[PDB]
Design a protein around this ligand. Sequence first.
Ligand SMILES: [Mg+2]
Lengths: 46, 1318, 572, 49
Amino acid sequence: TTRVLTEAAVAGKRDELRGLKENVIVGRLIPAGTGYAYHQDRMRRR
Amino acid sequence: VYSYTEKKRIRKDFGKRPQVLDVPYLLSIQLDSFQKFIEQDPEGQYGLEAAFRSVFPIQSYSGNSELQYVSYRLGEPVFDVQECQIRGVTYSAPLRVKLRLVIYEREAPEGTVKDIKEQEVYMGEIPLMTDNGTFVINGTERVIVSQLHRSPGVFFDSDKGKTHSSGKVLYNARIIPYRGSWLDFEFDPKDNLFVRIDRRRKLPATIILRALNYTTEQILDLFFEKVIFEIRDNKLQMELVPERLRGETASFDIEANGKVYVEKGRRITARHIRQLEKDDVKLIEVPVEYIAGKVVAKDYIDESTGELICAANMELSLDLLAKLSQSGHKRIETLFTNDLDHGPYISETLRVDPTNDRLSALVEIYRMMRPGEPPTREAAESLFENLFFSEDRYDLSAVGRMKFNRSLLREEIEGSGILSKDDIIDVMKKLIDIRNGKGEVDDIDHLGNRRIRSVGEMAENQFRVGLVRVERAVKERLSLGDLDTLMPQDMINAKPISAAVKEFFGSSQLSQFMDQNNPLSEITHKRRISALGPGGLTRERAGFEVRDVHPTHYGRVCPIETPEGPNIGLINSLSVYAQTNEYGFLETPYRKVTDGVVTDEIHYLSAIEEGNYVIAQANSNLDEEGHFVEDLVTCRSKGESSLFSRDQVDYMDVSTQQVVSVGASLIPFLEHDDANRALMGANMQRQAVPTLRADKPLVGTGMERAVAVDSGVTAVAKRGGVVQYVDASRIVIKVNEDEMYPGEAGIDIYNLTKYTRSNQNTCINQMPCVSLGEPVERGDVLADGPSTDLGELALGQNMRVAFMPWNGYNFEDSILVSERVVQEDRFTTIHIQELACVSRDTKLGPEEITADIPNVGEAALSKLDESGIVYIGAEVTGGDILVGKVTPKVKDSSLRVPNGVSGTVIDVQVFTRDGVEKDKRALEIEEMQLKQAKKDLSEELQILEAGLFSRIRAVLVAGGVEAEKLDKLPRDRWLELGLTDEEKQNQLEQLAEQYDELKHEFEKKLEAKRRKITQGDDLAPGVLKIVKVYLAVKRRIQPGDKMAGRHGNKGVISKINPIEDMPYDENGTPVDIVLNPLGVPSRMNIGQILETHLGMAAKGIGDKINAMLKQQQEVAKLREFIQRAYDLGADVRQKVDLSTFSDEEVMRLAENLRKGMPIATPVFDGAKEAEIKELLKLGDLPTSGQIRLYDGRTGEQFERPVTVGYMYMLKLNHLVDDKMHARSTGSYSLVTQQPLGGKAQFGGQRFGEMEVWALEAYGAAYTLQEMLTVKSDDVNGRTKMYKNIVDGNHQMEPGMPESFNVLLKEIRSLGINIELED
Amino acid sequence: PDLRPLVPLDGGRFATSDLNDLYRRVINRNNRLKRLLDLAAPDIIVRNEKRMLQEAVDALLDLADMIKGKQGRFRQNLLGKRVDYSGRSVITVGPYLRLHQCGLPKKMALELFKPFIYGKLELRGLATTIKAAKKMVEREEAVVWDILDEVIREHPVLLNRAPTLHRLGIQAFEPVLIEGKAIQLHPLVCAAYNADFDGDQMAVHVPLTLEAQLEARALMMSTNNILSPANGEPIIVPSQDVVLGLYYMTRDCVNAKGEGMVLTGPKEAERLYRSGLASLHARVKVRITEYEKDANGELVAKTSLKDTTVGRAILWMIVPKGLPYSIVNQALGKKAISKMLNTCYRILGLKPTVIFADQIMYTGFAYAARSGASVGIDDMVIPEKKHEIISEAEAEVAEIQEQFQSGLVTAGERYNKVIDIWAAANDRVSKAMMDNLQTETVINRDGQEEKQVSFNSIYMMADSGARGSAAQIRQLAGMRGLMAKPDGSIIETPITANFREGLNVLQYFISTHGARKGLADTALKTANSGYLTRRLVDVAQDLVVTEDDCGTHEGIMMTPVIEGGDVKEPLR
Amino acid sequence: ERMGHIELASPTAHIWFLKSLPSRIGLLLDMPLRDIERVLYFESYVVIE
DNA sequence: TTTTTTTTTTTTTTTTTTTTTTT
DNA sequence: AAAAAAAAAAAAAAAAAAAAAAAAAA
Ligand SMILES: [Mg+2]
């Protein structure tokens, strides 16, 4: 936690939320299985 | 001849090896240790007096006031063990120390003190050891596990392997005190020796050596020998001794007397050394160049300059040789350097040394100890000196000194606790010696390097800590010392000693909470050796060398009982005969052997003494004299085994069992099954559960007697006698007059313990096992504790088992059980749960215990008395009320039964804070206990008076016998009858005085008991009264409970079928339990099959006995049959006839054997294949042990006959209803809104990280989102999903995880700014 | 404050986290610093105050543990989250189940679907207030059970074990309400879970939403997972009892009842065996019809006289149409059945394979029961040459020992020679024991005499591959070989004894040396493998298949692997 | 949901950036971490302008 | 005599819960 | 009597990485 949070804070790195672990943290559909199709819809919006 | 109590059911045995040492009191360890912990022994010698003499006397510096010791006493406890168990107080005793204080005058130290005082100061209390060998701490029963800690002294280690990945083996030495800062030395790839204290920053070693006021010249001379170059007009001729020439290549010609002895370039062979020796050639010539590579040892100065010609420890050369030559010093000293014999280690460290003087060395050590401060001369001096040379912060006990001297090849074993310069010097010498090849590193796993701390030593340590704390406080207050205005009750504070000892006994990684669901669980939980705990290692820091059994574990530690998994081998259990040495080492028995005779004496040997001797293995054939019948016998000498000659072995193993422990010696036919499943079974057997009827396991190992009698569960008799009055409650024994003391005659009474909670909630109880009016032998079982019968350890039950895969219900290891098993009430266990309701006082009023409760169905109040408490015997079901507690406002907060549990209240205790009103049912229980105590004391006095007056009658048989006048008047006056001038009248007067004293004692003891009961049992501060209800639930066996044999053949009980469809033999008997054959080969335990065969044979003989007894076959037939059964073939130790057995005894034996014949089998000296077939042959059952079986459903034969016998199977404490736990929606956690875990809280399972990976491994996405957002976290989401579900909709509303926002807030609490975007 | 609650313990006391203590310390120190600065204290005292305040802020901040550690928010509360609608129990076997369903205790069923039963009762109209349904379920009204059968009708649930290693660690199953308190499990699927029935506890979860229900049935249903993700080998390979039953069903003996006749079809073969008039195995000609789709997906029937075995013909009724006949003309060991299921899956798709696996389990357990394949102590014969081989080995080692005594060889040479000859003698005993066992049967053929593959119980259970193997049987009858002293330094006095005979004390000590290291290995090896898997999944989380084809030509060369001998793994 | 705050009379140096190894403030000012720690712990002085 | 490279050494991570000391 | 850290057991084994010291120049 220490190193990662320090680097994120100093860099001010916005999070893209593309993989599978981060999305689980956020609590939204994983872009891995069925949710992929849903993501294929949402990315189509933008 | 055997004890008639054993004649009740004499166990058949097959052990051929004649025993020589009976199994000792299995609990010798704890009992002996705590006996050592408390007794009046002078001169210390490992006792409390040792601690007192260590810390007393106490005097302030020049205070003219010393505080000396006299003696100590431990008065009676305040209660007795059972009373402490029921109430909760610690079964403790006081410490009355006769303390003597005297003060001097000014300038009269040797002069007599002007004042003296002595008083029996009181200093807290300490727990004592119950008879069984336990401790009662807060009402529970706790036992302290002996620790196997690394022994003090000096120990050398290699540290090979991945050290630098260079292959250069390092070396290091450690001096470990029994109490104090460690000391460590190690080498390095640069071969520079180093030191370090308490694993702090590394330092060179010479610096510490120099810190002992050693000059560098002194150090070099001490460490290295001298080589003397003499200037004889040129060339610096050498005094050469041959001894220092081995393995050397001479680059210059070596000659003397004008004759060449070693030509240039020729290496010194042994023959050259012989030449220089025989020729006695010592003085030789050397060239200047040869001295260039050498190193000066000391320092020289010139006559005029007086300056440093050359520093010590520096290489020479021609210019330096001239520089020292002008001074004209004839003696040129060097230290012998040879990379193969003596390397430049200390010299290199001297080169690395930072400074020279002692002050700078002390400064360096002071900075290292407490870095970041100014070093000081005096402070550093004191720090270094008392860090190792003061009892304040250092001490090596006797065993520490023993190891230290035995590892430096010293002679004396007794020395000072502190070290000395010579000691560290010899440690250096040994370390360098081993570096040079001579001497070997000490394998730590060797037991002699490890030692067993028992309860006595740990309690001594903590008592010492408390004593030193109170002593420091005493000195602080004596600094204010005043003129005798006080007695010595204010120097001594009770809080430190009691605090330390109680903290140890209550909270201690070793003082584990006792395991009590067996006899054997105790007997093998107090004989447990835990490598963990303070002073030992921890699970993390344990490689696979400590765990592994060392080949010296033989005879001292069991290799086949250790907990499996996270700690294998860290909790090795003690052996059977293994005991502790005086110094703490593990001694084991052996049989002394002369030239060729195995002397029947016994000789105990330690872990190191064994290696020196060569020891013969247990099962070596001897014939009537001990002379081995084979010249070459298998024997072990030094960590290894091989064949050795007959006239070479001076020691023999005592009994073939001394390799194993009580926790595994009971596994019958152990020698046939693999070590793996043997270990698993041995662990399992400790997890049995006391069933409803102990059933004398058919296949035993003859150790059942010792475990049952010594475990303490069985109320073993104390003085032989006749069982006058028997009952489930008490047993009364009339001791024989010869066995009873003349005065204080009386009789004996045992109050059998009834159904009470065991520490794992299983039922512990006793039942009488002696008929009314029968003789009893001293030290014999009278009541059979749980899982026992007739004084034999019966954990599970013998059952008819058959090995065949029956319709797939025995797939992996599952066990199929006929309904007949549960019908007969065989495995039905009794569990007892304790539930507590506390009545405190808080703001807005106290918590009453009334019955009146708002908004409760009257049926709830029906089961309570008027007070609001349940009766003894009202079957309670989940949800109802036990005790009515109300919080003033007023709101109902009454105690309720935990959800999902049946029960039938068996007892309700009610303790009340001293000086508080007793409520209706509390008064009722008070009256109950009062009446019970009154009845006990009254019947005691009445029967005692009856015995005394019967003695008076016997006395009056002569000396004025008056039959008419004896019954004319009642027992009020029996001393007024006429007698002559005889001592009988005096004895009658003595008996009348005894009667009056008995009346007075009964009255006053009854008063004391009434006071004990009347004073409400005090409670913790803040609470008014506590009520504990015991619910006594009964659990049968259902499809999912666990049961297993003794060889580790686990299995969860599957579908229990109706009796009809089980396989049935030709005779029709069903087979109760149908295991899986396929578990035999892979899990290599063929023991269970032989056990099953022997079980079938045992029940064959049992069936024959039962048949010949059902028919009237008086004595003769059964007598001869039993006698035939008991001899049965080869040599056996039993050799039991039956003429001594009177017909009554014979028929009692037959009755107790009708259910089967208990067969014994010592572990490795057990029954072979030949004898089992012989026993079967005595029966009417097939020799092979296989009988055809008919399928229950189809009703036709099974081809390929199957194996059926009687195997002893346990029930393990994993009941399905204890595990089966579910939830739909209940309370969530507060800090995070997540479902609770565990079982005590009504929780839900854990969807762990691994489960999440497995889910996303599929394409399953929505399910994971539901799992970790809507079903676990989203506070609003789950409510909405519930509402939708009740409305028939399966719609999901995402929302957001609550704990996610919690994390966001928390990290925003730090100096982090995190937010959400579009 | 809510995230730092002041929880009072069971009585008149407060025991909350250190956060409140740290905050109290920080605020107290800050107030004291403000007060001292108001008092204008000397720079030394205020310096101490500022340093103390800095320390207090350090202690309050390093929250870290809440975010750090195995018990941190990310790992204990975000990733691995306890969940409602869950339960657990000890597992137990049941044959009567089909692969697409698993049993469930009634109590857990009524407890898990309680929201579902309340909703179903409300919709059904049998009650209006949900409390009425609550009192109904508490009363265990018989109506509730019918509602339970309605909800459970087809509503998969997830059955997960404790160490979830591979994706098969969680499988869906159709519940089948059953009395008791044990989670009944399909036997075959057990092999996937690495779940043995020695008391292992499995958890049950319930999908809630229609998305999740379809998700569980379409992916996590046990039918959809009969081929493992690690490799193409089937994962539903029948394990130990089914295999023994099948193998005993198809194994030729020289002669038995019904030997030497002609049967018109499998049906009368079953009729003959079950009636007891014909032995379960006897080489016999019969008529079998096999269906082959060699054409363009069209079944062609072929029939003729086949030499087979009665039990084999009976088994043939369970194979579907497509498969050939020679597949069941062998002994049907474990590997044979595995590749037979693989052929079924490859040639007939999926549903036939699921039906076939259920049927093969049924027909394996049944005939294993009919076999009565027990194990008595006389099922493992000690070859007579064991004593003679051992005595010759003793003579040889003594001769080499005295040769070393004379100084002809070194200690190392003597040690190596002794170990080598002990190994050779061990191999000799092994061969003697295998020759004794495998062809033990010496029986009449209706003529004088004949040998055949042995029917000795242990040999049957070892040859079929049910449990154990040549290595495991070897130490049940012949010598255990030579076990290792603590460091692998194999002792020059091997275990001359075997489990059937007795083991002396020292040989058992040596066996303990051998086995304790294995147990400790298992423990710490599992500990380390958990962390290896942890890193492996962590470093490959992002990769999710996203494109059909990159249109790239580059690649890697693929060739068979040879290290310096025969091919270890072929190109295929 | 609602948070709080404490107005500190003396500024406080956040600690995560102090011992991150490499410290953020450490190489941001291009000075060794030991000197920074000593200065912050009121046992030394630093030059400003 | 200063400066770059490499080596060595020190420190910080990697799978059950707080009294004593000073002002 | 009130406020505050962990100096007050502990070390194993291994690895990553930072800081200091020692070659080896030109
Ligand atoms: Mg298991």
